[PDB]
């Protein structure tokens with residue numbers, strides 16, 4: 001279990017460093033914003049993972065709290081989504097993470113179920129907007145933006161959907177997956193979402 005944590009920490013740190021240095025050689029005002037958000041996300045995750053090493057799993061949850069909104073923001077900026085749409089997405093993200101926590105704080109099965117159903121419903125709304133709403137918006141934009149968004153979209157929807165699955169079969173849920181393995185799964189997901197997506201985004205001309 002300690003290894004996945006050390007691994008996660010290292011991968012997040014290197015991802016952050018890489019995005020930071022890569023961004024230095026960029027001056028485009030549009031590109032810089034993406035570098036800002038994209039570098040900040042793994043920076044936040046690194047801090048939390050390193051913290052878990054120093055210790056702890058609520059720390060990882062807290063990083064989800066900070067990073068999910070920024071990831072959504074990254075996508076919103078790519079398709080130049082209007083403020084309202086973005087606020088709604090971020091608000092839904094807060095509900096997702098918020099209810100996930102409240103459901104975790106309740107001991108009675110029925111309340112937990114509803115809180116997490118609400119959390120899942122919030123995630124589904126987010127995935128719907130990205131997949132359907134953002135896709136039409138991207139297809140009316142320059143080819144590079146449309147193509148890069150489609151890839152980020154596909155990756156995002158797959159990775160995000162995996163979290164509740166792992167959560168539901170892990171120690172917070174049915175208790176089928178051992179803490180040891182769950183930590184591994186969430187680390188792979190976190191790195192893929194916060195370093196993998198950034199790589200795809202920042203290596204594209206779509207940010208200019």
Ligand SMILES: *C/C=C(C)/C=C/C=C(C)/C=C/C1=C(C)CCCC1(C)C
Nearest residue numbers: 064100119120123160163164167193
């Ligand atoms: C870097 C971290 C990322 C992209 C984290 C994403 C986390 C989620 C999409 C979590 C979703 C959950 C539910 C839909 C139900 C309740 C439990 C959660 C919080 C694991």
